[PDB]
């Protein structure tokens, strides 16, 4: 499915059950991050990325600029 606003919710619960039957190596890390898939190519593939938080003041090393350089 080319990206749309409801495909966003589908990829969130999909990463949820997928990483959960494998058992993610830490059980409380699973609901503090998820993947997030907004313009459409023709496919959701190679159009999805990561959403994960950051803590005080670890963010000056992990500034919101360079998380894009890794995501691209």
């Amino acid at each position: 499915t080319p990206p749309t606003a409801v495909t966003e919710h589908d990829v969130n619960v999909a990463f949820q059950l997928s990483a959960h039957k494998v058992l993610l190596d830490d059980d409380n890390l699973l609901p503090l991050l998820n993947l997030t898939i907004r313009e459409a190519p023709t496919s959701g593939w190679a159009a999805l990325g990561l959403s994960y938080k950051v803590q005080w003041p670890l963010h000056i090393l992990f500034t919101p600029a360079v998380l894009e350089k890794y995501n691209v």
Binding site: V6, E8, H9, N12
Partner: protein, 81 residues
């Protein structure tokens, strides 16, 4: 009170809990005491639950009130038959 139900005090989830109450009086008054009138009382209940399902689906946003997650348990129930 956000956690309770909330319903933004206006939305048809508040109309379905009002309306399923209106059939509940027909259920106690017929059973305390008409068989075609029994089955109509729950055909209206089946109207009201199928009305609820389409409302859950337009509330589904990506995460929006802790009742939503628990409602999608029942949605996938509905999918299972």
């Amino acid at each position: 009170l956000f956690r309770g139900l909330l319903t933004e005090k206006a939305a048809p989830l508040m109309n379905i809990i009002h309306s399923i109450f209106s059939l509940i009086l027909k259920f106690r008054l017929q059973l305390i005491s008409n068989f075609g009138l029994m089955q109509q009382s729950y055909n209206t209940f089946k109207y009201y639950s199928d009305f609820l399902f389409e409302v859950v689906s337009k509330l589904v946003n990506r995460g929006y009130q802790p009742h939503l997650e628990d409602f999608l348990l029942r949605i996938n129930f509905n999918s299972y038959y």
